[PDB]
């Protein structure tokens, strides 16, 4: 229902990034532009190693 913040890190990029949990659009690494998370068929899934929650609220 309510969206939350989640901190993730690119496995290939190895860089840390913050994306939304279960987004709508494809998440491209702000670094190079590699897929870090895919919305797939309903319910977005993070295709990266999740670290924890971020303090960066909405």
Which range marks the domain in which residue 6 is found? 1-58
> End-to-end alpha-carbon separation of the chain, Å?
15
8: CATH? 2.20.25.100
The domain total for the chain is 1
- In angstroms, the CA 19 to CA 30 distance is 11
- In angstroms, the CA 39 to CA 20 distance is 11
Indicate the annotated binding residues: 10, 13, 29, 32
CA distances from 35 to 1, 9, 28 (A): 25, 12, 5
CB count in 10 Å sphere of residue 37 = 25
Indicate the annotated binding residues for Zn(2+): 10, 13, 29, 32
SS (H, E, C) 6-49: EEEECCCCCCEEEEECCCCCCEECCCCCCEEEECCCCCCEECCE
Q: Which 8-state DSSP code applies to residue 55?
A: S
Which structural technique was applied? NMR
């Amino acid at each position: 229902m309510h969206s939350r913040f989640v901190k993730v890190k690119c496995p290939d990029c190895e860089h840390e990034q913050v994306i939304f949990d279960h987004p709508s659009t494809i998440v491209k690494c702000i670094i190079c532009g590699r897929t870090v998370a895919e919305p797939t068929g309903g319910k977005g899934n993070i295709k990266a190693e999740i670290i924890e929650y971020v303090d960066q609220i909405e």
